[PDB]
Amino acid sequence: HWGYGKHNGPEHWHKDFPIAKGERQSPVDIDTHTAKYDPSLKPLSVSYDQATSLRILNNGHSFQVEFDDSQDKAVLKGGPLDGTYRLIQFHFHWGSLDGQGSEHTVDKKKYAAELHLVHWNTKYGDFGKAVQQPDGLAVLGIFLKVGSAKPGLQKVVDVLDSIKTKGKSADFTNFDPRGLLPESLDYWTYPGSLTTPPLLECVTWIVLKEPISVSSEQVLKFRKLNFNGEGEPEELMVDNWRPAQPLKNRQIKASFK
Numbered sequence: 040h041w042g043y044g045k046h047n048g049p050e051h052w053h054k055d056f057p058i059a060k061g062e063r064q065s066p067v068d069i070d071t072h073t074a075k076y077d078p079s080l081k082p083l084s085v086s087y088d089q090a091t092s093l094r095i096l097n098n099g100h101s102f103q104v105e106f107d108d109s110q111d112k113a114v115l116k117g118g119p120l121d122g123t124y125r126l127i128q129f130h131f132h133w134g135s136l137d138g139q140g141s142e143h144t145v146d147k148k149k150y151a152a153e154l155h156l157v158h159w160n161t162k163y164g165d166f167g168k169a170v171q172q173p174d175g176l177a178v179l180g181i182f183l184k185v186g187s188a189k190p191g192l193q194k195v196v197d198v199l200d201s202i203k204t205k206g207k208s209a210d211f212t213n214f215d216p217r218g219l220l221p222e223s224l225d226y227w228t229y230p231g232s233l234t235t236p237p238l239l240e241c242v243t244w245i246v247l248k249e250p251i252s253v254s255s256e257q258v259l260k261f262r263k264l265n266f267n268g269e270g271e272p273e274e275l276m277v278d279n280w281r282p283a284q285p286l287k288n289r290q291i292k293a294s295f296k
């Protein structure tokens with residue numbers, strides 16, 4: 040099965056998932072001088088005040104916080120989207136060192152981690168149907184840089200001990216994802232894919248220009264997680280990021296100049 044090690048890592052994925060070499064793979068490097076400003080682009084609409092978190096899971100590749108998506112509780116609209124997209128989960132990608140960890144890069148700069156807020160287009164009825172559609176998902180990508188602590192992240196950091204190994208989960212209610220957003224919602228956007236198998240090309244990527252700051256201590260706890268299950272040999276969960284893929288026939292658009 041796939042992973043991020045020396046024998047099952049991203050360069051190997053294409054043997055089981057040939058779309059890995061597809062035309063709209065993610066992530067990509069955002070070249071800030073060739074991104075096109077598009078005034079036609081609307082502001083993002085983030086409506087998370089009614090969000091309902093349920094659970095946090097070590098899924099063996101990352102950890103994810105899951106939400107109730109049976110109704111329009113927490114949705115993303117606007118930006119380059121038509122239709123409304125419900126929040127289903129968020130997760131992170133991070134590095135073994137502060138100089139790497141993000142999936143997207145900006146002018147080849149890497150950040151310490153990257154947060155993905157995953158949303159699916161309600162017109163398709165359920166998540167499994169949405170991932171088979173070119174406009175099925177919208178993922179909000181937020182960069183993390185090491186500096187001052189982020190108060191809104193600490194509730195997450197504090198429960199990681201409880202889900203240290205693969206398949207562990209814990210109740211995680213009343214978490215407000217608004218505490219994870221930057222002040223500005225300016226963004227870049229491009230059509231792309233899931234960055235983990237099955238790598239389906241169903242994602243409208245929305246990557247925020249402004250990073251959020253987290254402390255060294257906060258990102259250190261991420262690095263204490265395990266890829267393995269309980270009772271197995273310990274392998275620390277680090278460097279669970281895919282490198283940049285060729286842009287090919289695509290234009291990155293910016294909502295700002």
Ligand SMILES: CC(=O)Nc1nnc(S(N)(=O)=O)s1
Nearest residue numbers: 128155157178232233234235
């Ligand atoms: C179920 C689920 O949300 N799947 C994900 N797979 N890759 C994702 S990512 N890194 O592109 O946001 S989301």
Ligand SMILES: [Zn+2]
Nearest residue numbers: 130132155234
């Ligand atoms: Zn992700």
